[PDB]
Amino acid sequence: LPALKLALEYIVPCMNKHGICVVDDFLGKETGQQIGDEVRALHDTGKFTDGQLVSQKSDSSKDIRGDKITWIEGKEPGCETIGLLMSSMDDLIRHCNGKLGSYKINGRTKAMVACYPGNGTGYVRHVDNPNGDGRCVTCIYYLNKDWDAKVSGGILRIFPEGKAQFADIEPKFDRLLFFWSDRRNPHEVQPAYATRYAITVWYFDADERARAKVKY
Numbered sequence: 001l002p003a004l005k006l007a008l009e010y011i012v013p014c015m016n017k018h019g020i021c022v023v024d025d026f027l028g029k030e031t032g033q034q035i036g037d038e039v040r041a042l043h044d045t046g047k048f049t050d051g052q053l054v055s056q057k058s059d060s061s062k063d064i065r066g067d068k069i070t071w072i073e074g075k076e077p078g079c080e081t082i083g084l085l086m087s088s089m090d091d092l093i094r095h096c097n098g099k100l101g102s103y104k105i106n107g108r109t110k111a112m113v114a115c116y117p118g119n120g121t122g123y124v125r126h127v128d129n130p131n132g133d134g135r136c137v138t139c140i141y142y143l144n145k146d147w148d149a150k151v152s153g154g155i156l157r158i159f160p161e162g163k164a165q166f167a168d169i170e171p172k173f174d175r176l177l178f179f180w181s182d183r184r185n186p187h188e189v190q191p192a193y194a195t196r197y198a199i200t201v202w203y204f205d206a207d208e209r210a211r212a213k214v215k216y
């Protein structure tokens with residue numbers, strides 16, 4: 001489907017009504033696989049950090065670390081398909097401008113590739129942008145083939161601001177996700193028992209970002 005059709009007939013209305021939207025088979029198998037290879041290459045070549053310090057025991061040899069990350073601009077050699085993913089995300093956002101709430105997106109962060117090693121670590125409940133730093137939309141792309149939460153866990157659980165119920169999102173291969181970055185979407189990553197890859201990009205609202213500068 002053309003970016004515009006997907007955006008106008010689904011993303012725009014979905015976001016305004018739910019603020020949490022999922023798009024499966026975003027780029028297709030071939031492209032998704034190539035991205036998976038680039039991300040795996042980054043890992044195998046030691047480009048990721050050692051992982052978030054989860055448990056710092058008296059002894060450091062036994063320390064437990066979680067999600068590993070690496071920032072990608074999208075033009076570096078070996079990550080061009082990722083840059084392509086980022087472009088696809090952008091073209092999609094552009095077709096939504098003026099329709100995603102009253103926000104006016106004028107920029108984004110670089111891509112943050114994250115890898116949960118599968119040692120039972122997850123990510124505590126949190127809000128991406130709780131202090132109004134400009135980020136209005138969180139965009140996540142998953143690259144995990146044949147991922148079964150019942151077996152590997154790693155489920156993304158979001159707790160919509162008012163609703164009681166929460167939404168469980170599986171980090172399925174070639175899946176794209178959109179959700180408001182503010183306090184309306186507190187979320188967390190349940191313990192992952194298998195290698196879990198995801199690529200995140202945050203979009204900035206023009207006004208919020210402009211005055212964020214003031215307050216720093």
Ligand SMILES: O=C(O)CNC(=O)c1nc(Cl)c2ccccc2c1O
Pocket residue numbers: 067069114123127128140155156171187188189198
């Ligand atoms: O990956 C997922 O399905 C959900 N991930 C997150 O919500 C998430 N959020 C933040 Cl702010 C960070 C921040 C740093 C590293 C990983 C993060 C992460 O996976």
Ligand SMILES: [Zn+2]
Pocket residue numbers: 126127128187
């Ligand atoms: Zn988050």
